[PDB]
Every structure is written in structure tokens, then in C-alpha cells.
Amino acid sequence: AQYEDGKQYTTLEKPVAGAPQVLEFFSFFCPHCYQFEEVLHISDNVKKKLPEGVKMTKYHVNFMGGDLGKDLTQAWAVAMALGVEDKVTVPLFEGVQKTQTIRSASDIRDVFINAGIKGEEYDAAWNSFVVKSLVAQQEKAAADVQLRGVPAMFVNGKYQLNPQGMDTSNMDVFVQQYADTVKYLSEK
């Protein structure tokens, strides 16, 4: 067939009940995640091709970068809680991987401040239980699919994208194949 299990995607041996419709995992420490988001724009290109009524969820993971990695998962919860993902995703990636100016929770905080989030608002969110349960949601989703590498994307707790079986010669064509595959799996 044009779309084949084991080729553009794989099927989870153990399907996750009540999983988000489209679920992307990343780390700000993850070099191909930087490519996916900052150069290829996978999240954005998948999302604009999703069927009506299919929402996209993106979670950060802990298993890279040690102590700073968990700080970044908590910061990504703050980003989700305040709805400022589209303001902090670029400087977080560049601060960790490009300029390497993010070395502490405080440096992470500096990115939000520069992006215009007030210190008091960031600190209140950072310390909030709403953010703790958002951290918990992120960890649970990653645990549900026994996640050990990023970037990764899952559809309906049933299918896992498999980009290794796709042509990378043209970045534009790769992205649309990836996106069309998510839409296909979405409609399955």
C-alpha cells in the first residue's frame, strides 16, 4: 500500500487508552528536535494539515540533560499554562543549543522575562500546582508509550511516526510527507 505499517509509521504493541489525538515529544537539549522545530517546522506543518476537531499536544521530556532537562520540562509546563509556547520555543532552543547561555533555572527564567512574561507571573506559575499537574501530565504521557528517544510523534495512542523511512534530500518534501502521514493516521 502507499502507507505501510513498519514503513512511514509503526503500530504500538500496547495501545494507550485515552491518549491525546496527536502527541509530539521533544527536548530542548535534543539536536534533531532543534532541526524538527527551528528548521523544518514539523509541529506547525503537521498542525495546519490536521482534520477539523483534531488537536495537537506537544510535551517536553526529562531523559535528556539531567537536572536542567527537568527544569525545562517544568518551564514547558509554565509555557503551556501561560499560553506562551509561540514566544519562548525559539529562544529556549537557541539558548540551550545555539548560544549555550542556558545553564540554570534562572537562565531559563531570563528567556521568559525577555519574552515579556512578568517575573511575578512566571514565578507564581513555576511554583503553582496547576503547573505541577502539567508536569505530571507530560511525564505520564511519555511513560504510557515507554518513550526513550525524541523527537517522536504518536497518533491516537496507537501509531508512532517513523521518519527514518522517508527521503531527507529535500527538507520541504520531507516535512509534507511527515504531515500527510499524520493526517492519514488521524483519519484511520
Look up residue 57 and give its three cell numbers.
499536544
Q: Which CATH class is domain 1-188?
A: alpha beta
Is 161 in a helix, a strand, or coil? strand
The method of structure determination was X-ray
Q: Residue 73: which of 47, 105, 42 has the closest Cα? A: 105
d(CA 85, CA 61): 15
- Sequence spans of domains, the chain: 1-188
Strands 159-161 and 9-11: antiparallel
Peptide bond into 151 cis (omega under 30): yes
Phi and psi angles of residue 53, each rounded to the nearest 5 degrees, phi first: 85, 5
Q: Is 127 left (phi over 0), alpha (psi -120 to 50) or beta?
A: alpha
Rounded-to-10 torsion of CA 126, 25, 112, 37: 180
Compute φ and ψ for 61, nearest 5 degrees.
Answer: -125, 160
Type of residue found at 127: N
Residue written as grid cell 491525546: 20
Q: What is the DSSP letter of 51?
A: P
